[PDB]
Amino acid sequence: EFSVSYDDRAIIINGKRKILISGSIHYPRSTPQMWPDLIQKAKDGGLDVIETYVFWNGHEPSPGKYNFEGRYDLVRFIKMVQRAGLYVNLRIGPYVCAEWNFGGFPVWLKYVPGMEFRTNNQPFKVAMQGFVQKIVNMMKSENLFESQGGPIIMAQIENAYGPVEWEIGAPGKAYTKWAAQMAVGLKTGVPWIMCKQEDAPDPVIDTCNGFYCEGFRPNKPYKPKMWTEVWTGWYTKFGGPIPQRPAEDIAFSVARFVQNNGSFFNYYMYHGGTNFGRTSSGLFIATSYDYDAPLDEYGLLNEPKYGHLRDLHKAIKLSEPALVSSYAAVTSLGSNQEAHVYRSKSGACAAFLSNYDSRYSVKVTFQNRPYNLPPWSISILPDCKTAVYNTAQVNSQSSSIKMTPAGGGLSWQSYNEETPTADDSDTLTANGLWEQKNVTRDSSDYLWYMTNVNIASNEGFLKNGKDPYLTVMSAGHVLHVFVNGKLSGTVYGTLDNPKLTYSGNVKLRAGINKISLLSVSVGLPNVGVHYDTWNAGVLGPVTLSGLNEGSRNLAKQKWSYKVGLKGESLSLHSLSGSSSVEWVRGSLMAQKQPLTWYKATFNAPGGNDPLALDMASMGKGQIWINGEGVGRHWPGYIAQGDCSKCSYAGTFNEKKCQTNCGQPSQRWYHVPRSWLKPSGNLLVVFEEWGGNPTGISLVRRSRSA
């Protein structure tokens, strides 16, 4: 009764070939209350398919122990897409990349004996197989594959493994063949895909990802041409600018794919949303995952992009009957101009008129009619006669963002975190430096590295006014050097160069001195060959120079360790644990002091406009609302980059249209309205660096013209 197949031309759904317009919405990057609205906006946006990864590390935070509640109710999500009458592309992975913590892998999986990620490895294959089968059976049980009458029209195994293969060699090739075969073996009833996988074995369709995919061809003539990730922008990193991609360029890129036998394209992202909590964003990925998506982080329409693409879709639909019953024939129109014509025997005809010149308009003559093609544009003629649309002629009104403060400054109470000093009587120690992930298992961003340094009272520097020199090399990502109780410096890295060295004169005194290093990870790496093996934390070298002896290798002494903060162990973020301790009030409020907790109670504003926290007054830390993790803040990290003004025309790259340079990387932090009660809301902020909580203001988001 229902089926999904495919031929050289398209995916065939229930016996009908389709030109499928898709967009990505990641279920855990918004709330269940937001989903129907997001999905409805997608539908009105002209999307046929919603595409999502599955996030293993969210769904299995402990072997055998699963989570499918709240924003992680995968089944609830898929069912809401079905209710909107849209299809689903379930990209199961379970390596997913996605700028997501560890690429989606549960951290515990690293520490399974014999384990090795994304290669021909028995522990890996068992774990991977097990979870993929769990997800497929969960879907099948509720008849959620299209074959069974459900919305899922295809699924992805792995993610962009192709590049990784080339470096890993034969074991990669064997893993690829295994992953494809095992996926197909789960008998979903619908096609399987792998992205960036030139060697995908039948019957798996290999797809394309990027800014443009118009030249791409699947690895067999009898597979449709599909573009699984049309990048709508780029991620925002802490330390980085807000990257935009011009709607006119996207529409061009899409038109250019479709005109050339493309039959499936998917905006990555259609709704980017938010990296909530502390196990969502990957290495240095900002809380905001806006991606300059057609639906902004807050779920509002990103005009004009949203509309311009709605118009594109409308035009593709007018062309569809012709598109699906012919093949693209190319007629040269000029030096740098083409016609792509889909003429069926039924008489139905659709034409695409292109101008690849990035500088000049060209007048072109097609079937006796003149067409002005703006630079870097395509005109779509659904009947081969009248241009209903052109990729550079944007007929939606633009929109910009306003954040209107609402409520005011709340009453704050503080709670100072202690700066721990090692001693003779510690619990968890070793004669060397341990890698952070290994020690913390990612239970917290924080690991204290602690040691004693003995200074003999005859030391040269003691006789004079001098201070010895301390070098702390760390694999990243932030490091606070504490000497004899006091903060001595803070060094921090970038996505590209997460490595750190602190280098400074430290005032030591005769006898036993206390060094305490606060090592902080900001998400776990999520992309790269052997990215799981990359280190975090202070693995040194660590030297103390300017002594009677030459330098002293402090990696070679006894170290002690404290995982996490005490506020974490006390859950000062939840309502129960917060009022199980006692906080400072009034005048004696923690002002610009590191490692501080702050707490306040507020009423939800009225209105139906999305809400954020203005955290400009703050440094770096985490935010909770009624015990639910809003995410990490890091307004302290100023955006660095090249932010020239750009035009839509010409080959786009992620750095072309960057904005907000010399401003806080992310100032506003999304708060889902579904997280609020009318009154008595608990706002907890751990401040890592130092900030003034008073000026923390709640804000209301609208989009003007």
Ligand X SMILES: *[C@@H]1O[C@H](CO)[C@@H](O)[C@H](O)[C@H]1NC(C)=O
Ligand Y SMILES: OC[C@H]1O[C@@H](OC[C@H]2O[C@@H](O)[C@H](O)[C@@H](O)[C@H]2O)[C@H](O)[C@@H](O)[C@H]1O
Ligand Z SMILES: *[C@@H]1O[C@H](CO)[C@@H](O[C@@H]2O[C@H](CO)[C@@H](O)[C@H](O)[C@H]2NC(C)=O)[C@H](O)[C@H]1NC(C)=O
Distance of closest approach, residue 250 Cβ to ligand Y, in angstroms: 14
Binder to ligand Z among 174, 330, 456, 529 (CB under 6 A)? 330
Please choose which of ligand Z, ligand Y, ligand X, none residue 8 contacts, taking the beta carbon within 5 to 8 angstroms, the exact cut-off set by kind. Answer: ligand Z
The reply to whether 98 sits near ligand Y by the rule CB under 6 A is yes
The reply to whether 438 sits near ligand X by the rule CB under 6 A is yes
Task: Please report how many Cα atoms fall inside a 13 Å half-sphere around the Cα of residue 156, on the Cβ side.
Answer: 31
In the region spanning residues 211 to 250, those forming contacts with ligand Y, defined by CB under 6 A, are 229, 231, 234-235
56 versus 561: smaller Cβ distance to ligand X = 561
Is there a contact between 244 and 236 (Cβ–Cβ < 8 Å)? no
Binder to ligand Y among 30, 159, 326, 413 (CB under 6 A)? 159
In the region spanning residues 534 to 553, those forming contacts with ligand Z, defined by CB under 6 A, are none
Bond before 94 cis per omega within 30 degrees = yes
121 versus 438: smaller Cβ distance to ligand X = 438
99 versus 357: smaller Cβ distance to ligand Y = 99
Cα distances from 459 to residues 462, 467, 472, 506, 594, in angstroms, run 6, 11, 21, 14, 32
9 versus 480: smaller Cβ distance to ligand Z = 9
CA dihedral of residues 330, 331, 335, 336 (deg, nearest 10) = -40
CA angle 573, 629, 65 (to 5 degrees): 100
Query: For the residues of 318-374, what is the DSSP string, one character each?
Result: HHHHHHTTS--EEEEEETTEEEEEEE-TTS-EEEEEEE--SS--EEEEETTEEEEE-
Distance of closest approach, residue 528 Cβ to ligand Y, in angstroms: 8
Distance of closest approach, residue 221 Cβ to ligand Z, in angstroms: 6
- Coil vs helix vs strand at 228: strand
66 versus 434: smaller Cβ distance to ligand X = 434
User: In this chain, which stretch among 327-335, 411-419, 458-466, 517-525 interacts with ligand Z, using CB under 6 A?
Assistant: 327-335
Please choose which of ligand Y, ligand X, ligand Z, none residue 160 contacts, taking the beta carbon within 5 to 8 angstroms, the exact cut-off set by kind. Answer: ligand Y
26 versus 340: smaller Cβ distance to ligand Z = 340
Distance of closest approach, residue 159 Cβ to ligand Y, in angstroms: 6
Binder to ligand X among 8, 116, 435, 614 (CB under 6 A)? 435
For 135-203, where are the E strands, in sequence order?
Answer: 152-157, 192-195
The reply to whether 196 sits near ligand Y by the rule CB under 6 A is yes
The reply to whether 434 sits near ligand X by the rule CB under 6 A is yes
The reply to whether 260 sits near ligand Z by the rule CB under 6 A is yes
**Would you tell me the crossing angle of helices 35-44 and 74-83 to the nearest 10 degrees?**
40
Please choose which of ligand X, ligand Z, ligand Y, none residue 98 contacts, taking the beta carbon within 5 to 8 angstroms, the exact cut-off set by kind. Answer: ligand Y
User: In this chain, which stretch among 152-160, 323-331, 467-475, 583-591 interacts with ligand Z, using CB under 6 A?
Assistant: 323-331
Bond before 269 cis per omega within 30 degrees = yes
Distance of closest approach, residue 524 Cβ to ligand X, in angstroms: 15
Distance of closest approach, residue 196 Cβ to ligand Y, in angstroms: 6
The reply to whether 165 sits near ligand Y by the rule CB under 6 A is no
The reply to whether 157 sits near ligand Y by the rule CB under 6 A is no
Distance of closest approach, residue 98 Cβ to ligand Y, in angstroms: 5
CA distance 288 to 236: 7
Binder to ligand Z among 261, 354, 560, 622 (CB under 6 A)? 261
Please choose which of ligand Z, ligand Y, ligand X, none residue 229 contacts, taking the beta carbon within 5 to 8 angstroms, the exact cut-off set by kind. Answer: ligand Y
Instruction: Find the residue with minimal CB distance to ligand Y.
Output: 163
The reply to whether 97 sits near ligand Y by the rule CB under 6 A is yes
User: In this chain, which stretch among 28-36, 56-64, 431-439, 566-574 interacts with ligand X, using CB under 6 A?
Assistant: 431-439
Is there a contact between 331 and 341 (Cβ–Cβ < 8 Å)? yes
Is there a contact between 444 and 484 (Cβ–Cβ < 8 Å)? no
Across the beta sheet with 611-614, what order do the strands follow?
400-405, 697-704, 611-614, 668-671
The reply to whether 328 sits near ligand Z by the rule CB under 6 A is yes
Query: For the residues of 443-490, what is the DSSP string, one character each?
Result: SSSEEEEEEEEEE-TT-HHHHSS---EEEEEESSSEEEEEETTEEEEE
Please identify which residue in the block is written with the tokens 């898709």.
Answer: 22
First to last CA, the chain: 48
Q: What is the largest CA-CA distance in the chain?
A: 99
CA dihedral of residues 236, 119, 277, 581 (deg, nearest 10) = -140
CA distance 241 to 658: 6
96 versus 190: smaller Cβ distance to ligand Y = 96
User: In this chain, which stretch among 239-247, 324-332, 553-561, 583-591 interacts with ligand Z, using CB under 6 A?
Assistant: 324-332
Instruction: Find the residue with minimal CB distance to ligand Z.
Output: 328
CA distance 34 to 672: 8
Distance of closest approach, residue 475 Cβ to ligand Y, in angstroms: 22
DSSP alpha helix (H) spans, 223-275: 247-258
Q: Which residues contact 232 (CB under 8 A, 6 or more apart)?
A: 245, 250, 267, 268, 269, 270, 272, 291, 292, 293, 294, 305
Of 469, 311, 456, give the one whose Cα is nearest residue 395: 311
User: In this chain, which stretch among 299-307, 325-333, 491-499, 631-639 interacts with ligand Z, using CB under 6 A?
Assistant: 325-333
Residues interacting with ligand X, by CB under 6 A?
A: 434-435, 438
Using CB under 6 A, list all residues that contact ligand Y: 97-99, 159-160, 163, 196, 229, 231, 234-235, 268, 527
Contacting residues toward ligand Z, per CB under 6 A: 8, 260-261, 327-328, 330, 340
